[PDB]
Amino acid sequence: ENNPEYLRERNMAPDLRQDFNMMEQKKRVSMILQSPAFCEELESMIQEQFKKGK
Amino acid sequence: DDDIAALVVDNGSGMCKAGFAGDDAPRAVFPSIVGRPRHQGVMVGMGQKDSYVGDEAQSKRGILTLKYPIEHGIVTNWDDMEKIWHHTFYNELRVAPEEHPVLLTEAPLNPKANREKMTQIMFETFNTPAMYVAIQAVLSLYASGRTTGIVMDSGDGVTHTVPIYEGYALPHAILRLDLAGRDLTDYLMKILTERGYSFTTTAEREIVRDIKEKLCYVALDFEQEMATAASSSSLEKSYELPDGQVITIGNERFRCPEALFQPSFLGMESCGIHETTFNSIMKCDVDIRKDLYANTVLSGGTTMYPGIADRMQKEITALAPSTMKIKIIAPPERKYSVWIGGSILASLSTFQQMWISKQEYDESGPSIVHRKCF
Amino acid sequence: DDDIAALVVDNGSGMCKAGFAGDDAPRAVFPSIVGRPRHQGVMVGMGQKDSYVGDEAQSKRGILTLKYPIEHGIVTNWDDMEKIWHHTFYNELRVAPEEHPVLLTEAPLNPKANREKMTQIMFETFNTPAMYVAIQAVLSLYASGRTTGIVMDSGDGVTHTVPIYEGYALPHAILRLDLAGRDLTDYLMKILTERGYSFTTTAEREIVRDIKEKLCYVALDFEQEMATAASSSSLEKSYELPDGQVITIGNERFRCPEALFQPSFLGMESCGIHETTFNSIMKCDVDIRKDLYANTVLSGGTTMYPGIADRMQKEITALAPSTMKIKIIAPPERKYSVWIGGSILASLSTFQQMWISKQEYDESGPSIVHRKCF
Amino acid sequence: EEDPEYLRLRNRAADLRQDFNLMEQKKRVTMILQSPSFREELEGLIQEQMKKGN
Amino acid sequence: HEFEALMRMLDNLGYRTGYPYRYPLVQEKTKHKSEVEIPATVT
Ligand SMILES: Nc1ncnc2c1ncn2[C@@H]1O[C@H](COP(=O)(O)OP(=O)(O)O)[C@@H](O)[C@H]1O
Numbered sequence: 001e002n003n004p005e006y007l008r009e010r011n012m013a014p015d016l017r018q019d020f021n022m023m024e025q026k027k028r029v030s031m032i033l034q035s036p037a038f039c040e041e042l043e044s045m046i047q048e049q050f051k052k053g054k
Numbered sequence: 055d056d057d058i059a060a061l062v063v064d065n066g067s068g069m070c071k072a073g074f075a076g077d078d079a080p081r082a083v084f085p086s087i088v089g090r091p092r093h094q095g096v097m098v099g100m101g102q103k104d105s106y107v108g109d110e111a112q113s114k115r116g117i118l119t120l121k122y123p124i125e126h127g128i129v130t131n132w133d134d135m136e137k138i139w140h141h142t143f144y145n146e147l148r149v150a151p152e153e154h155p156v157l158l159t160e161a162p163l164n165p166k167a168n169r170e171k172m173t174q175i176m177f178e179t180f181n182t183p184a185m186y187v188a189i190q191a192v193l194s195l196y197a198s199g200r201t202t203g204i205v206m207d208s209g210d211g212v213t214h215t216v217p218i219y220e221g222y223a224l225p226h227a228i229l230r231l232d233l234a235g236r237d238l239t240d241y242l243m244k245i246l247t248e249r250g251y252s253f254t255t256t257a258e259r260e261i262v263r264d265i266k267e268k269l270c271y272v273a274l275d276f277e278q279e280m281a282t283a284a285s286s287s288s289l290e291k292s293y294e295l296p297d298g299q300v301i302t303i304g305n306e307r308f309r310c311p312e313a314l315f316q317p318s319f320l321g322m323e324s325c326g327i328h329e330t331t332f333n334s335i336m337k338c339d340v341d342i343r344k345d346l347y348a349n350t351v352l353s354g355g356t357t358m359y360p361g362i363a364d365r366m367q368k369e370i371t372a373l374a375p376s377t378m379k380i381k382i383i384a385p386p387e388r389k390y391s392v393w394i395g396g397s398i399l400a401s402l403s404t405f406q407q408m409w410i411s412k413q414e415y416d417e418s419g420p421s422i423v424h425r426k427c428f
Numbered sequence: 429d430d431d432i433a434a435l436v437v438d439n440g441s442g443m444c445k446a447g448f449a450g451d452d453a454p455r456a457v458f459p460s461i462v463g464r465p466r467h468q469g470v471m472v473g474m475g476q477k478d479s480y481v482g483d484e485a486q487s488k489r490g491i492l493t494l495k496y497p498i499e500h501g502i503v504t505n506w507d508d509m510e511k512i513w514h515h516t517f518y519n520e521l522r523v524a525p526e527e528h529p530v531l532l533t534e535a536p537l538n539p540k541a542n543r544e545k546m547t548q549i550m551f552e553t554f555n556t557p558a559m560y561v562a563i564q565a566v567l568s569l570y571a572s573g574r575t576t577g578i579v580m581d582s583g584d585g586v587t588h589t590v591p592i593y594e595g596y597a598l599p600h601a602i603l604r605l606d607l608a609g610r611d612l613t614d615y616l617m618k619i620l621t622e623r624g625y626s627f628t629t630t631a632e633r634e635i636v637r638d639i640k641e642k643l644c645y646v647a648l649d650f651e652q653e654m655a656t657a658a659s660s661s662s663l664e665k666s667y668e669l670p671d672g673q674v675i676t677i678g679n680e681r682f683r684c685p686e687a688l689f690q691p692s693f694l695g696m697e698s699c700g701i702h703e704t705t706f707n708s709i710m711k712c713d714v715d716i717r718k719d720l721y722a723n724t725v726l727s728g729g730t731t732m733y734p735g736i737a738d739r740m741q742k743e744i745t746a747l748a749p750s751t752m753k754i755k756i757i758a759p760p761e762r763k764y765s766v767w768i769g770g771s772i773l774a775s776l777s778t779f780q781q782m783w784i785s786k787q788e789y790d791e792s793g794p795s796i797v798h799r800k801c802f
Numbered sequence: 803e804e805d806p807e808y809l810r811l812r813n814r815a816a817d818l819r820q821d822f823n824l825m826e827q828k829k830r831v832t833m834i835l836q837s838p839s840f841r842e843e844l845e846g847l848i849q850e851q852m853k854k855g856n
Numbered sequence: 857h858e859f860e861a862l863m864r865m866l867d868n869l870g871y872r873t874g875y876p877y878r879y880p881l882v883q884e885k886t887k888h889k890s891e892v893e894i895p896a897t898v899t
């Protein structure tokens with residue numbers, strides 16, 4: 001029980017730990033990448049915005 | 055890409071978040087404070103640094119003068135930001151900056167010299183291979199799953215509302231307002247002095263901020279709620295100070311956030327947040343009004359007060375035209391959303407053309423960031 | 429005498445002053461102290477009392493524990509406060525309070541309930557017909573002859589700077605600092621220990637306060653004056669104690685008042701008075717700052733140090749922009765100026781409408797003072 | 803002597819007498835009061851605090 | 857006089873006019889001394 005993984009955990013403020021647990025359960029980043037249509041849509045958005053840039 | 059993940063570093067005015075791209079959770083979130091000792095140290099062998107940064111500084115609040123490097127969304131101490139970035143890279147994550155790309159977020163409207171200084175600092179000293187600068191309010195809509203809508207953001211620095219139309223930030227309709235969490239904390243002190251409790255040092259400001267975070271809510275109707283609070287004592291709650299004393303907040307719980315809706319309490323002559331959002335939509339063209347009223351996203355640290363959603367909906371309904379589609383979309387994780395949007399944006403394969411190489415910076419100076427990143 | 433004239437009572441932490449309405453001078457000025465015997469008393473048949481009040485308490489300092497009823501501008505022992513007010517009404521003025529109205533002064537920012545207490549023990553016990561409560565620093569501006577300006581009042585208990593525009597004060601720009609003359613007396617007693625002289629009891633604190641009133645001044649430049657004291661011995665004065673001993677304070681004459689401008693000597697976080705009034709000015713609007721620089725008025729007992737005006741003007745001019753003009757206003761009778769302002773306020777014919785009637789108090793309880801007094 | 807005026811002169815210190823003479827010479831209250839313009843200007847100003855408070 | 861006044865007001869709109877003034881304009885607030893006001897008394 002001497003590794004730093006224990007260390008930060010008891011140096012966590014409790015609410016930050018619980019927010020980590022909740023957004024761990026929530027998994028937003030995985031859903032946004034797994035959805036095909038919105039992913040390739042935002043790819044098109046940034047691509048032709050870059051194309052308009054130079 | 056596969057071997058190395060870009061570092062997602064969100065530099066909020068009050069807190070700093072850091073993690074790896076493609077991951078759900080940031081690895082380290084810590085306050086953006088730097089403290090210097092204020093008393094003479096007489097113990098020879100216990101070890102005293104010149105300055106404490108981050109959570110170590112906030113642990114020893116009693117012997118430090120806490121200073122914030124970011125003031126009203128404007129950096130006022132650049133070497134202090136060098137310290138906070140050094141603490142982020144080396145201590146919190148234990149990763150070298152020269153082997154991974156970094157991603158930086160920024161306010162929608164900042165001076166040009168600020169962007170130039172961030173680019174110069176990030177390339178000259180840390181020697182990062184690739185960096186990119188993104189607007190803070192844009193990434194929240196990407197985290198929302200949306201490409202069209204109005205984004206209201208409120209942190210410890212400043213509160214601004216922007217419209218986004220298929221990923222385009224309209225520069226004319228972006229509106230700014232100086233109602234942040236720090237001003238609410240100062241007003242909480244100013245109204246706490248009525249009951250008889252006095253806080254004056256920078257150490258107690260964290261106590262007052264914790265009181266604001268834990269015991270506040272937004273009244274749906276102010277006039278009825280003041281009569282309710284005067285009639286009975288059921289609204290009063292007790293808080294237990296670090297030295298063991300117990301205070302009763304009572305009436306002030308719905309008086310602290312009310313400065314957001316009526317800025318005349320703080321002496322500011324500006325309009326409320328609801329009028330700011332209404333005027334921000336009013337400045338755009340007619341064609342996109344329908345999908346701005348029908349699509350509103352709240353984000354930022356200040357927007358997690360309980361009951362802010364219904365009050366915001368009612369106040370924006372009172373100003374909208376008749377039979378108008380009005381809806382407020384507030385995610386529960388609304389003040390971790392900027393990091394989520396940054397990791398999402400860094401995760402894509404077509405994003406890799408956004409990176410600024412070291413050769414490009416060396417050729418074109420610090421002014422290349424504005425031409426490369428529009 | 430033919431008509432009932434109001435009583436103007438100025439009540440701070442240090443001394444209490446009382447006089448009649450429209451008079452040039454207050455009739456009674458005496459320290460606000462209540463003393464109680466500590467030693468065994470064996471002399472039967474002669475004058476002994478269980479408590480001494482007023483100047484009689486300071487006469488027999490050697491057999492009492494002096495106890496100030498007002499601490500940091502807040503009343504902490506109400507029985508001694510009632511005893512002080514009884515001695516004010518009957519022993520000094522020798523007029524019954526039921527015939528005449530009374531006017532009281534009070535600090536700008538304070539606990540709310542104090543005002544209620546000042547109501548309840550004034551109508552119920554003394555049976556006054558009417559009273560009124562006014563902020564202390566507004567009366568200084570009224571007595572100076574100006575309706576617009578910023579005023580600093582630093583009494584024995586609390587320091588506060590308020591800006592007033594068109595004779596009608598601004599609540600949001602009020603700055604209050606808990607640094608006054610009593611803390612200066614304690615600091616002087618602490619730094620007089622280093623020379624060898626020791627002062628520990630209450631009578632010794634009174635003697636040290638007398639030493640401070642006799643031999644102190646504010647240096648125009650701290651470093652230059654300190655080097656001057658390092659060069660020669662021309663900055664030495666000899667004070668003769670009531671015992672008959674002679675002490676030579678020397679270097680400490682300009683170190684005791686310097687805590688007003690550098691409160692880091694006491695360990696307090698807040699900075700000096702000059703930047704305090706500078707921040708009070710900066711919290712106001714831009715348009716009114718021009719009148720605020722030209723109408724700075726000093727008041728209170730602590731502001732009678734020699735050379736306070738020049739040092740204050742130099743510091744506030746160093747802080748102010750170069751295009752702006754600075755004017756300090758130092759009345760030669762500033763120590764009583766608040767009371768003089770009260771005499772102005774009790775003579776106006778419109779002020780007859782301001783009085784809180786006894787019937788109104790009986791109808792509305794002790795909470796009438798918040799709605800009636802501004 | 804037993805007269806309270808003689809004791810009044812006997813008790814109080816020199817600086818209180820000095821201040822009393824100093825602020826008896828200038829007569830600030832009279833100068834504010836009998837001067838018409840300033841006096842009736844504060845008259846009016848107190849009138850609008852009555853108007854404005856309730 | 858009329859054209860001078862028109863150039864003056866147009867200059868106050870923010871317009872840059874090269875018209876120089878035969879009679880220039882002086883703006884002074886001035887001040888009325890009042891005996892009730894205490895002097896500044898600074899040195
Ligand atoms: N759980 C909470 N409840 C109430 N207020 C909160 C909560 N969490 C954060 N805040 C407020 O949000 C502020 C932090 O905002 P933050 O999100 O760090 O701004 P930024 O967008 O610049 O990062 C703090 O001052 C705090 O008052």
Ligand SMILES: Nc1ncnc2c1ncn2[C@@H]1O[C@H](COP(=O)(O)OP(=O)(O)O)[C@@H](O)[C@H]1O
Pocket residue numbers: 439440441442443444582583584585609610637640641642728729730732733763
């Ligand atoms: N001539 C003086 N020189 C230096 N300090 C003084 C002088 N007169 C009074 N003081 C300080 O000011 C204090 C009195 O302040 P005062 O204005 O009477 O307070 P208040 O009137 O608010 O009760 C005294 O305790 C003393 O320390």
